[PDB]
Structure 1
């Protein structure tokens, strides 16, 4: 998301980790839409917990299934 927003992906990610550790524990993300500053929590931008949890479960369930296939058998055309 930082590369598509025109920001340094390494610099912004390392900056957000310092704001959530040395300062205080909170949610401050990369800026997807144009705004004056950081802290999307001030913008009241929310994502559903059941929606984000459904994403990480399907991503893990598929990643395991891909690792469970070590062989590919593709028949030709008769």
Structure 2
């Protein structure tokens, strides 16, 4: 659907409504909040992948 139509506010309806268009379902999120999910994730995983030596001193 999203490849066909350019309207980009259709997602997964979890409450079981008959229509997936989110204009009528009253759901809104901030841009700064959804952006930080990608930024803090992709910036952390760079650090996770760059570890080769892993030394853990037993307590």
Give the TM-score of the pair, scaled to structure 2: 0.77
Kindly report structure 1 stretches of 4+ aligned residues shifted beyond 2 Å: 23-26
Conservation of the 8 A alpha-carbon contact between 1:27 and 1:40: yes
- Flag the structure with higher helix content: 1
Tell me how large the CA RMSD over aligned residues is.
Answer: 1.6
CA-CA distance at 1:32 after TM superposition:
1.9
CA-CA distance at 1:49 after TM superposition:
0.3
CA-CA distance at 1:37 after TM superposition:
1.9
Structure 2 segments unaligned to the other structure (5+ residues): none
- After superposition, what is the alpha-carbon deviation per residue over 1:18-65, rounded to whole angstroms, capped at 9, x for unaligned? x22223332210112232221123213111100001111110111111
Task: Figure out how many residues of one structure are paired with residues of the other and give that number.
Answer: 59
CA-CA distance at 1:66 after TM superposition:
0.1
